[PDB]
Amino acid sequence: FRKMAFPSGKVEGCMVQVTCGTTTLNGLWLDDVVYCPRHVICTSEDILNPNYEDLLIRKSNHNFLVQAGNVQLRVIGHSMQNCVLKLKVDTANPKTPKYKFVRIQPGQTFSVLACYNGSPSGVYQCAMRPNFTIKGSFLNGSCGSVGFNIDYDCVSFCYMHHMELPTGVHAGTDLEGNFYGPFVDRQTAQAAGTDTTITVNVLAWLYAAVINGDRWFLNRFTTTLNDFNLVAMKYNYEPLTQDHVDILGPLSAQTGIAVLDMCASLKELLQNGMNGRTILGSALLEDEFTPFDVVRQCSGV
Amino acid sequence: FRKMAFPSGKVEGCMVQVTCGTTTLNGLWLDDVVYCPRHVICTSEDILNPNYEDLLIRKSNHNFLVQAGNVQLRVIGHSMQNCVLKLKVDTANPKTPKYKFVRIQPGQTFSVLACYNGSPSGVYQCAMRPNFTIKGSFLNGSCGSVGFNIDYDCVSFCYMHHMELPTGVHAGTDLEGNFYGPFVDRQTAQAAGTDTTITVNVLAWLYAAVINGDRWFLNRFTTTLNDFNLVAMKYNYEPLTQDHVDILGPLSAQTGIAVLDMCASLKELLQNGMNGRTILGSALLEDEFTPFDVVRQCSGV
Ligand SMILES: CC(C)(C)c1ccc(N(C(=O)c2c[nH]cn2)[C@@H](C(=O)NC2CCCCC2)c2cccnc2)cc1
Ligand SMILES: CC(C)(C)c1ccc(N(C(=O)c2c[nH]cn2)[C@@H](C(=O)NC2CCCCC2)c2cccnc2)cc1
16 A cells, blocks of 8 residues: 555646746646646736736737747637636647546545646645645646546546745645635735644545554444544544545445444544554554545555 | 656556456557566466466467557567566557666665556556565556656666565566566465665655755764664664765755764664654655655756
8 A cells, every 4th residue: 555646648748838938837738728827927026916917918929938848839829717827829739638627625635747847757646635735746847737636538637736835835726727725826925724634534544554454453442423523623633524434435344344433443543642553654644545545546446 | 745756658558458368467568569477377277386488388379368458469479588478469569668678776766557457557656675575556467567767758667566475565577577586476485585774765865854844853973884884784774885875965965964964863863763753744764765766856857
């Protein structure tokens, strides 16, 4: 078991370089449209509080250098959708895959194809934190890189990277340009909320642990949703809905451990720590595997 | 910072399904040759101790079902190179990339494109353990999947997956069919050696930590290669050569921390533990990032 990302080829053929002035960042090229963050048009003079409708008026199609590999794309149109710029180009990407644009939920995971200058550099798995940040690995110029899921031959695009928040975490939008969370594409004082722990994900990781022969933390007891949740709010774990229990049905059925039985096991580790013990090679509780990531890794989808 | 894998598209176009009898596993299709493990030809009757030259004699080209996606490939030849079967087919893979075949060293890392039935399912980063095993995430039928590095446009193939060892770790070969380590493609009692810790890699991960503002473990002292190594053999850490120090030159120069200064810091954490503290979100010392992985992740190659 291990953090595992989707194969990235379907998405690598879509990454291009977008230049605007002396600003360079990554774009996503689907059919005849290049999606990139709209802060590409900011100059260092306007970053504190840019007027984007105004900044974009001063721009002309030929201020926008789009490069696919080493081919140069002809920008025949430019418009702004929320925080995303849509650059209409004259070629449709021959490598465009079947795709949809999805807004994901806090707790859900995706792969990230980290790019610089339109070239991929790496792929890794992320979760959307409950406070709508992502704990990424992104450098300067990683802007425009995308997060995605692949359900056989269909790429669901769900995240486009925009900024680092000075706290070291990352903020971005869906592919329609709406930020995840309260954040703005502006160099301004911005705070993420307090960041909680995705309980349903920690429970799935415990199931993965049991599936892989690591079972020391399994215990006697049961408990209820109500009583476990009330311990859960004390360690800043997210409330466990009844749907979360239902989402864990396949995992529970595969191990013979009922959901509330595993909760009772988790409730103990919260009040007691792991006391020098590991679980799946880790001394803390992991919360960035969904129950699907765990079923998928243990079913070889 | 994070375990980060190479973009996998160049390798996804090379994965095919190879069937032989009722055995199904993955093959690697480069130009007109499909590489796959030779244990594809084993029946459950011969697995305890197969005679492979003899088993292969009984086989004919048309016992070998090779499928590329849903295209069927015509096998016009079959031969055995060490533990690898080379199936000559009549089509050259149109998607063949620039590639070399490399045998890597214990300690070195690579990405794995985990496949089943010739279709990719996920990509993750691995290290070759000093005992020539890999701590993988592989299920039944993951045989034939490959490990690789990408140095701009050149895929270096370095690992092909063969078996799980009952201890839960994984064993395989280079693309010339020679096993890493003492292992044999035979259902027989096999033991990996005692598994040590890649010291040069742990030092690089400490540098990554310092580069990312996490510095609590940095200390006063220095030490020497000789004196640190002598603490190092006590915690089953690998000996630190002088080349390892030289390999750490770029990292040391970027942080202003000399190599032996960082060693003195590591020597303390060995004798004292992390005492509830984390480093880069981890409560143990990571040893599966090379100094290049750390420079690459902190330079955006
Ligand atoms: C104009 C605006 C919206 C303020 C902005 C400014 C810079 C960038 N950053 C570009 O690297 C970059 C590259 N090309 C254009 N911007 C980086 C970024 O967020 N620093 C923020 C850090 C402190 C708060 C102000 C900006 C970045 C670093 C690491 C990983 N991810 C992104 C992103 C957005
Ligand atoms: C014939 C030979 C060499 C003994 C062999 C037998 C089975 C396989 N395994 C196939 O899954 C598989 C699929 N198609 C053909 N074999 C699996 C495997 O290693 N079990 C070993 C476990 C105990 C020791 C005997 C075999 C496997 C599981 C998980 C991840 N990786 C591989 C590999 C090699």
